[PDB]
């Protein structure tokens, strides 16, 4: 019997219960976006998690948005270009979390979010 860690084990939604993604594994997740014609977009934040400062009304939370890195990468054909921008974001904000979003312009909604860098 092992006890599930109660401290130091905070999470970032989809894929964050897996081992940290290798570069090759991250490129495969980005290629999954590209094959589906979804637009990758990076965002970053030193605060990693939601909070409730301004309202506790149902389904209101603060901290769901992070800060956009540049713009969604419309017309991206090469997953290595997302990895390149990841390294730029880390260099500018090495103390921030960085994650990769995906946008679906047919469903007209955000459709992907997974952690790409932890400080």
């Amino acid at each position: 019997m092992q006890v599930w860690p109660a401290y130091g084990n905070k999470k970032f939604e989809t894929l964050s219960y897996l081992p940290p993604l290798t570069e090759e594994q991250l490129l495969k997740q980005v290629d999954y976006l590209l094959r589906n014609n979804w637009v990758p977009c990076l965002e970053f934040s030193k605060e990693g998690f939601v909070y409730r400062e301004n309202s506790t009304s149902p389904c209101y939370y603060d901290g769901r948005y992070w800060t956009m890195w540049k713009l969604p990468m419309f017309g991206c054909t090469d997953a290595s270009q997302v990895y390149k921008e990841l390294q730029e974001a880390i260099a500018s904000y090495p103390d921030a979390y960085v994650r990769i979003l995906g946008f679906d312009n047919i469903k007209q909604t955000q459709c992907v979010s997974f952690i790409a860098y932890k400080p």
């Binding site: 019997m1 092992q2 006890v3 599930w4 109660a6 084990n9 905070k10 999470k11 970032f12 939604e13 989809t14 894929l15 964050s16 219960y17 897996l18 081992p19 594994q25 495969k28 997740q29 999954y32 990693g48 998690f49 939601v50 409730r52 506790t56 009304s57 149902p58 389904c59 209101y60 939370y61 769901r64 979003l101 995906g102 469903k107 909604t109 955000q110 459709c111 992907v112 979010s113 997974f114």
Partner: protein
Amino acid sequence: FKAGVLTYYTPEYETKDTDILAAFRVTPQPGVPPEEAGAAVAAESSTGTWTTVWTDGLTSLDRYKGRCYHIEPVVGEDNQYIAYVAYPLDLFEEGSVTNMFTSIVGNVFGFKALRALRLEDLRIPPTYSKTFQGPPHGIQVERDKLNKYGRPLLGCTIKPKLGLSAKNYGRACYECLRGGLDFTKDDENVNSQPFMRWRDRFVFCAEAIYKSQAETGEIKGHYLNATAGTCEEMIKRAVFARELGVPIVMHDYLTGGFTANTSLAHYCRDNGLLLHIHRAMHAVIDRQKNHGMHFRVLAKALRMSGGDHIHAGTVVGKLEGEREMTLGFVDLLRDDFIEKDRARGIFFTQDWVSMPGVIPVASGGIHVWHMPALTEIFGDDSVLQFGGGTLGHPWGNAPGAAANRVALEACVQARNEGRDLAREGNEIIRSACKWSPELAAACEIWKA
């Protein structure tokens, strides 16, 4: 006017874009021809009467009749037929699933000439569906509110449903949620009862929601059952969930009923609450192939009356034909436009004109080894419920939740890389067992 005792069979009638259409599986009594049975279905669900009445001369009753406009035989059945019936838009009270059901299924199932009758499908025209709010939020809004993308959601019904104190119940919830499930769940039977009164349960479940959310950094919820004996009690419970600031409440829509459900869906829209819908008692109506109403009709009705989740059964342990029927009504629940497809039990093309979809909830004895099949069949826009599959883990609720979350994310990761879940699923799970002791322990209890 003269007092005294196939008019409703109109095989050349052209359906109107405003008509509500019905597909009935009809079993005539011996000696009743299929055309007369189809005519009876239309008459006895509209304007049929046993003797002439003078008041008919004060209106134009052809404008109010249901018309059986097509009959087909059923393969493999010598005495079953699909009878298609068209109902004028003006029969129906705007916004009322209650009136839609009353008008179409209120009377006809008792007609003596019909040995058995099953309503299989309804074509809800946009002109009528636009009079309904629909889901309080729906799939895309819910994902945005909860900040959850790219995977099925995960839930757990607390067991035993009755027998725990409210505090012990909430303790179980906290341990499930902190291990990686998105939701825990009140059983459909758990309302307010001796030894666990609802407001006490709401307090302790809210404490568990927030403790696990603060611990994990992920937004958590618990389907707090608001089902009640009266509408006033039902709203009272939603109001306290509102005060507690929690994200999601629950309703047993068939046993509470559509009039109460529509009220609660309105309250949820007005207050930002997600609405989890349990389909308790559906199999009283929807199980037998020869009589009742197919679940897809009950599912369309819930989308109209309003809900953000709905229980949809399971596909594992089911034959290919049953899985095809499930996928058919899953598309009817989630999609904007669903083309007719008889192989999946979709009898009519269904256009929802931007009414949001409902997340289907899979449940029923599932565990970690079902994760590849469930992910492959339902895709991301689903909730997978693991009751015994979490609380039955040998290391407790948080490791059991973690095993389920790891199994699911392993499947999602592999799918996204282009691997085939239908053929590689067991190996994907075995590979994750190598680095996840929680999943390895689950995989020895339950079998591939």
